[PDB]
Design a protein around this ligand. Structure first.
Ligand code: A1H7Z
Length: 139
């Protein structure tokens, strides 16, 4: 039923990290955004930009920050060991929490923008660099 496209907003669950706001985008070298068990190429929102391929089973549509609590809770049932379960919590403090909060601010802005608007603003530029307007607003 679900098939993501470039510009779609998703929470991504990665080993060693809590659910993080992302945007589906095209891989700069392969030129694809999906491949086959299905994978999608995503950008991680925040001030320290990263990209990666994620499996669909580890993506959930992004609506807003309010979803995080239920994602943390529901994922606990499928993370039986302590090191996995502890990573579901929002980062305690420091630089990782500030990155996650900035990620959420950016994703919430993207969510009230159109697909093309969020793509023009938030897509990374490749030579991987942030769009200068995004970098200035983040600091
Ligand atoms: C895919 C990936 C690649 C590399 C690095 C390491 N990199 C993190 C940023 C600082 C330098 C070291 C982390 C991930 C990653 N895998 O799962 C999540 C979640 C992340 C991630 C964590 C934090 C941030 C991020 C992605 O991008 C946006 C941001 O501002 N911070």
């Amino acid at each position: 039923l679900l098939k993501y496209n470039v510009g779609d907003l998703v929470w991504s669950k990665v080993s060693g990290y809590p659910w993080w706001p992302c945007m589906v985008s095209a891989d700069p070298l392969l030129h694809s955004y999906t491949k086959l068990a299905r994978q999608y190429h995503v950008q991680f929102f925040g001030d320290a930009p990263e990209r990666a391929w994620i499996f669909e089973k580890s993506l959930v549509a992004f609506e807003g920050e309010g979803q995080f609590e239920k994602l943390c809770q529901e994922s606990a049932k499928q993370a039986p060991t302590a090191a996995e379960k502890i990573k579901l919590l929002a980062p305690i403090s420091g630089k990782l929490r500030a990155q996650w909060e900035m990620g959420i601010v950016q994703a919430e802005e993207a969510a009230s923008m159109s697909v093309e608007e969020r793509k023009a603003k938030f897509t990374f530029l490749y030579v991987l660099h942030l769009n200068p307007q995004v970098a200035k607003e983040a600091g």
